[PDB]
Predict the 3D structure of the following.
Amino acid sequence: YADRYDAAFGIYISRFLRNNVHTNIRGKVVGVNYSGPSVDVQPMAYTEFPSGTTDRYPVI
Amino acid sequence: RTVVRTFDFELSGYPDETFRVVLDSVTYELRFMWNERDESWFMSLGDIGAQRPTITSKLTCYSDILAPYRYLDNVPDGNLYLWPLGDIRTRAGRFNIGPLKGIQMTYSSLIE
Amino acid sequence: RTVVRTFDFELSGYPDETFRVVLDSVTYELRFMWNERDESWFMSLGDIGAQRPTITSKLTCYSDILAPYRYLDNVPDGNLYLWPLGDIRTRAGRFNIGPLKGIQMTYSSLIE
Amino acid sequence: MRAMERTYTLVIGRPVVIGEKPVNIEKFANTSKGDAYEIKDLHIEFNVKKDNSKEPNKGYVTVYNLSDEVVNYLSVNQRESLAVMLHAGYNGDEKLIFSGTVEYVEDDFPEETRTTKFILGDGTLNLTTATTARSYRKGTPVNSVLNDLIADLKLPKGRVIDFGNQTLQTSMAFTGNASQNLANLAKNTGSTFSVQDGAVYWTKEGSRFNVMFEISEEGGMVGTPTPKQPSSSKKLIKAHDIKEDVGMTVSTLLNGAILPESTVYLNTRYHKGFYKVAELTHRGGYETGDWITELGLVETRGELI
Amino acid sequence: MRAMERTYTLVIGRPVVIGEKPVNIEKFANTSKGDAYEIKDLHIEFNVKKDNSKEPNKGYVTVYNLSDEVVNYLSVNQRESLAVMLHAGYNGDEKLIFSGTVEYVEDDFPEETRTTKFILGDGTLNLTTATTARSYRKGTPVNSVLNDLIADLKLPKGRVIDFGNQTLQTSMAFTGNASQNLANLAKNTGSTFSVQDGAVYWTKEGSRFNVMFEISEEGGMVGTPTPKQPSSSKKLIKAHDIKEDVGMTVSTLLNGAILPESTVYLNTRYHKGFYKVAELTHRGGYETGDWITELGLVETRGELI
Amino acid sequence: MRAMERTYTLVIGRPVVIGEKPVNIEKFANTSKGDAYEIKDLHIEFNVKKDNSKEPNKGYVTVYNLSDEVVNYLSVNQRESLAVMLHAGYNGDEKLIFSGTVEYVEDDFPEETRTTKFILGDGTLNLTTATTARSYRKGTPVNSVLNDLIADLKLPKGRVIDFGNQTLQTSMAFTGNASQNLANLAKNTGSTFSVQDGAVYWTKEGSRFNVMFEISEEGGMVGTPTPKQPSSSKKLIKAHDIKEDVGMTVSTLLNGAILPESTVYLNTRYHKGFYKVAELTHRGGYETGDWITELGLVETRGELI
Amino acid sequence: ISPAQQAQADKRARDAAAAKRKQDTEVSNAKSREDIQYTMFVSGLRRGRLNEFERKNRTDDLAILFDSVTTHTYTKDYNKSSYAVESKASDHVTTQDGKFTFSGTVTDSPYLIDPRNMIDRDTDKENPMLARRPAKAIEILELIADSHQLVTLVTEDNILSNYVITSFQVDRSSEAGSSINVQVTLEEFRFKRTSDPKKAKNANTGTKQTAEDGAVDDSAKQKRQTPYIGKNAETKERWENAAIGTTD
Amino acid sequence: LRNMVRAVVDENNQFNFNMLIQGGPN
Amino acid sequence: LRNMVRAVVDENNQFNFNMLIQGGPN
Amino acid sequence: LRNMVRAVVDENNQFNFNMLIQGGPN
């Protein structure tokens, strides 16, 4: 469960990717610039941990 | 209101017992204090590590202790009673509480 | 200006005491020096590891020490007073400062 | 009149070959010559830990002054996975205590005494090479996904608790090692998956199975139970609630008829009640050393499955 | 006439609950009964390391022959984070030496003597669960970003050195744990961030703060200072230049009124000068063992902030 | 008449500076004053492991009661990489046994005896900082890619086995550290790449080079050879076939004229044949301790390159 | 069982508990006053050491004399590196703590009962054996060792100071009846408020919290606020609540 | 005597496991 | 005597290496 | 005697830290 030496690295790697290694995500445009086309994106996905805590992406 | 017996208690007679119990998958801490002049047990119920107890009441036989308190999110919804195993006239005492000491303190939970 | 008592001090009488305290969730370092000729305590207040103290003043009873200094980002906004527990005529001394020694040095914080 | 003395047996069989059906280490015991290399009366030191997690259960063994023929048979097959079984007990019977494959083997013979070393894995080969490639659409019953993935793993089903009428909420795809995918399904459905002595065990966290074992001074207990936290860290809490979070520890004379997923009853003078098992460690020194087993218990708060 | 004998005190309080304001372990000392469980005259062994980095400071403790009541109080709350404070000194005063939460606890009672174990973390709960979600546009002053993120972390501000009129060069977004994001801002701006005994310290690398401590034979030094490299590896160099890269080591009798980010003056017969502090380790054996503290110093080459 | 007594020498030179040509640690031996700091008659304990893999070979050393001047010279240069060479033998000659850079250095002087510590790396600086940026199109000869990448690494070519008329099948791009890219090309082409005592060695797995060394009781062997597996785990097999998978172990008196990629002949009474070398470990205690070397051999099944 | 035994177990617990209150209390006060200075006279006396023996009073500089001392030994130790030095590097040596031990005896039939000795504080002149002198010595000996006094030894040749007792032995063998043999061992101690402000030096106390059970600490422990004694409740009352407020 | 050494090695392994796995909501 | 300790530390390192590197087709 | 063992464990931890963190421009 948490006794083996390999499980510790497994959980550490799983948690490390959570706060980094962002590759792709869906979103919705909320701000649009027509000169030099650019858009502000609000990612839609999120998760709620069992401890009653939530993870929200900020506006990009 | 169908209910099923699911837990029983025992007391060693120490005047200031305090221990933690689990009921309906939730956990609570209980305190029992012995009163000399009134020769009765005082029970306090509250959450784990709570600053103050949520409920305090005096124990008596055949009386629904939790009756007026089934409206709080941290109070069991079951039934808590004290009834005797021996002669029906025996009242709750100090050392006579337990599965075979004479008085059966019991908790029962509704079926849901 | 509602204020609530939130901290009390004590002094061991050593002439060059220095210690760190936490007030309003912020941390400060205090120095106390005893003056022989004037028989009074000199208090210096400043940030942790600061080169020089921000405030220096002489302690007296029933006088608002911080009154003229609530305009700096590193000075508590509460109230610091010294008042006696015994006879009202007693003035601050060396060994008579503490919760039961005779003089009650206290800090109180406004309610926000 | 006799004393109460220890006994054990160690068996070495043919190389293990995975095929297209569940693997049973039992049938590989016999060697090409027939009877296997049995080692009984030689000082042996071993340590075998067991758990309920993704990783296999591994055990270590040491043997002193082996005959040259046996060592030669292990110099060969160094590319292969020999099957090994271990037995232990008290002079009247020996219970199976471990079964797996020889992951590692080395020999050091400085002057007076040779010392052989082993590292054994409980189903290591299957758990680390069984690939899968499966997919399902919205509406598929989850009970079908579970059975499909386990059959891929190619191991006997020790015990499983089906999900009922649960259905997938989103399309799913699974690749890579089957064990890893199953261990991920555990987190999102409150189920425990762990292989042990070749048997696949799938249960639900918090709940427990009768008093299959009773611990008391008559049952060869060793010292009083003590409360020990079941994990080396604490989690933030709202103070699923049903999950574990508490435990105790006990020690007993060696008894191989116990498994991590079983249930035990603790009849002592201070502590009394029912507990799950979470971890096992078997130690042994034939001529000198302990012959005991250590159990890590965990409190339960779920239904009596 | 007396001797110079050691003294200490250990306090255990209510479970720590994080809310919507900075956490102070001081206010959790009192138990529901009022006075806390204080342990004074029992042999204790402890080791407390401190540093200036992302990770919290952790300390270990061991106590022998505790009363059953105290152990019972810790058998309960095993799901919760009890607040603990430790004090030490010499028979006339005791300085705060550690404050945090009980991460781990276990009891082993083989025959003669029970031995309780602890693992304590300095703000572990806050540093590992404080999520954030913030963004800023080109032109935002960097001094505003720093203050915004620290307030999210919910800890008192021990000391901070603002950036001045610095402004962001590109749009920025921050998510996940606040501590991790701040530790990344450290690399790109030459600032050191580290929480310690509940206090947040944000300083600039290379520079140092007066002689807050002086080390000499009168100050209970233990042996001569020796030069030791501050890191276990060497970096390639152009041979920011202002960064660290050198240090020394010293040992002294236990003195809890010292912190990693402080400054010390070294008055010895060979070495003389000013140094920063980088690491602390407090050791202690009440009946038998050392009662000393070890400091790892680092040379400085920046301005005198 | 004499006895057979040990001897050694340790040299410390100028800081190593990487430039635009292959690095040779030999030319950095001389210090600004000319002759280097040589240490001969002081009790020394050292451990030096060598291998054929990406990682550099690292060795540890300890010296007791050094003069203050030498320690001062190392208190300085703590930001720099001093070149160091080590020699050992038997009273008539000393063979080069290690050469690299001082990665770490620390001094502890408790009361009676100072003890200096070192950690040395064999080409650590080059292997961990040599960046590359290269690309090639379909049809490029693989023999050209290999030479291009090695020249980037800036190390002398100890020995290389070219690929012949091999050609790339797909376009390739390489960035980051050159060593990492080369180590990846090893997997897909059955070649072994490893730097050692400054020399680059590129060979092919399974095959081996004459009897450059013979081991026998006359050759100062120590104990009989024993069979030990060359890896701590077993791989699944089809039962490239040419790869390793078997080995043995031997020990001998210290002899620095041996390298991991060499070939040895084993003339014992039980085992006889030719083997590759895979690992080396040199140990030494001048006044007290062993003065031997340990070799990990691996069986070969390829052509005699 | 019966209530008669419950009235007996209490006696067993009460009397046994009373023993600690006696022994444990005496050591506490013995450490709470540093004015007293103990001294021991092993030999030395008659060779002019009487010059300082007469200085000892009966209240501060207590002195101890044994009825006889058979042997006393003094020793020091040093250590050096066992490896050849690099060369002058004469710093490779350390000094240990010097040890001192001696053997003595206390008898029921003393020959000299000089009252200046603290053993003979209140010993009868005409009946030495009823005074129970050996019991007097042991009571003194344990208190000195338990409180960790820094003893001073006056010897034949030199004088030693800052020595603590680490072990002693007492026995009553069949031979030499009516007396006790005593052995002691001592080691050096390398020891290194109301004070003159001119001698004061900057000190530290680390982080500090609310001090002692005050008007605010009482709330933390849920204790009820201490009522104010009404010596005056007209002046402070209007100002105390307005400026200091109340803990709530 | 190896009993004494195994205990210290076990404690060090425990400390390392704690260092890797700590805090966190998951 | 450090010889005895080094052996146990080596064995523990061996066990950890085995735990990290095991099974697998590569 | 645990003092002797703690030293060896500390040295092994130091070696492992060095192995993980070495060289590099960052």
In short: The helical segments of chain H are 2-20. The first helix of chain H runs from residue 2 to 20.
